[model samples]
Target chain A: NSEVIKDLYEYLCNVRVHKSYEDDSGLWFDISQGTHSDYSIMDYKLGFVKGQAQVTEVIYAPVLKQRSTEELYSLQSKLPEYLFETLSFPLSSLNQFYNKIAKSLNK
Target chain B: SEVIKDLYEYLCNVRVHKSYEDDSGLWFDISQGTHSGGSSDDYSIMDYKLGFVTEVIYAPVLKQRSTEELYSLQSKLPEYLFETLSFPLSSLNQFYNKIAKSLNK
Candidate 1:
């Protein structure tokens, strides 16, 4: 059950996170409520096994710089397409993707 | 420049293959080479740029869905996974629209 989830976490960090970006705003890490979080400009990486999905009150804050609303919206508009590609893989194939990414990361 | 070139090589050598079942019980597989020649090292800086566009545009969406439903919808893998499994030709037009809009800006 958690095998898939563990693979996912490895895939995200060892592979995807290794790719460099144009800015300093790449991957940032956090830990809370028993979940490992990898926050990036584009998405939040949360790894887990079987369980519940819940939303609760905000208990943390970050004093970050503000940007133009248009820039924010531009980033927001791009999310759907990104999600589609990520979801396009099967759980089994995720390891394949992960390995391919590993080749690149280690190279 | 070497960094970019290395990145370009990595993206070029990359290929993707995936498969899954739908709610209707249909199964499918998709395979894509990041470069046109399909040769492992046959990628150019241009291809890397395109790949970058793709990763930035598509990755966040995939991340969102994994978080949104993969857990709650586990029992309904076929139905939910179908969205992830199928070819994305249906979504290509939207991708084009986004690219066009960005270009015009």
Candidate 2:
């Protein structure tokens, strides 16, 4: 889920996209779809789930801007809000939604 | 929607807990399943059809660990990441049925 990048910094457990970075450019959206590499910080960057499934996709390089130190600090200060804003989507009940889909797996 | 906001409030309060802050932020300390302390990086719950409760936790204490050290704990991560992403699925019904029938063989 590209939403993962936007939600990565969100602290709200429900909205926050839990993500971990790999030394390489690979960005994992689902936890189930990643192999735990020896050097990988986490298998998924955000929008993660548990399963043996794995998927790998390379991410583009980060864009660098020329904001000054003060501007940079100000921007960083608003990172959480900024990220959430960038990922505009209706927040819904995660447990209710996921559990409904996940329960049949147990049966 | 309300639940998501509640979680966000929890996280924001955590960030503002101490003060100006350092590299580290305050811990939310909400735990479930195997996620606890600084050990858990993610958490999620799934509804029968496809709903979830998830959280992403950040603790500087845990960040101190080396990537290799984190790797040592990778085996337990699925549980954590699932909780964090709160991902849901509905298309897998056919897939699961096939797998279940195959197992019956």
Candidate 3:
């Protein structure tokens, strides 16, 4: 039950995708996935579930398995070297959304 | 290992009971009134104590295991908890970031 990445982060067959929502607290979503619900950390960033989908291909693509020891040692290319450069746009969008919502409540 | 920096920054910004890291991974204690009574599926779950749940996650992905077999190797844990559970770094950041968002009230 495995699925490969195409463009964006896609959930594996075993993982369930929970839609992003705004709680009385604000916008929130679940990122990590696993087999047990009891140990799931609904908390973001600091606490996490240990299982599949935890690492998105976009962020961890460079570190993906290189198939063999020989290939691993010589591994290079095919992945982005600049990480935050990739993360900037998305981080910005989320931050903008936060300000938008907060400013709206002010008025 | 630049990907790891993003997670490190998040941990630094957020308020947690406590956290520390090494070459292998990180361990943090969240004693908030939430996310307690954890299952034995992952961590020691019993290692920390009441009012605080201690968690350790694998951070270095340079030599990530491709099979569940290698991941299970942690069960044999030489030091018992040098590598508690095999959660990745980014995921930990994302999980904690979930709690960092806008107010629930």
- Per-prediction interface RMSD? 14.6, 13.2, 12.6
> Candidate 3: deviation at residue A33, Å?
26
lDDT of 3 by residue, B1-105 (tens): 222223222222222234445554444433111121236423211122111122324322213344563344334333333333444433443433333231110
Listing every candidate in turn, what is its Cα RMSD in Å to the true structure after a full C-alpha superposition?
A: 20.2, 20.5, 20.1
In order of appearance, the predictions have TM-scores of 0.18, 0.17, 0.18
Model 3 lDDT per residue over A1-107, tens place: 11111001211111222334443433334332222222221111112212264332121112223135543332222212331122222332332322232232222
Candidate DockQ scores, in order: 0.02, 0.02, 0.02
Candidate 2: tens digits of C-alpha lDDT, residues A1-107 = 33432232231221242434333333223221111111111111233222344432222111124344663454344333322221211123323322322232222
Weakest 10 consecutive residues of candidate 3 chain A by summed lDDT: A4-13
lDDT of 3 at B83: 30
Question: Which scores better on DockQ, 1 or 3?
Answer: 1
For residue A41, what is the lDDT in candidate 1? Answer: 37
* Model 1 residue pairs with clashes: A81-B58, A82-B58, A82-B59, A82-B61, A82-B62, A83-B61, A83-B62
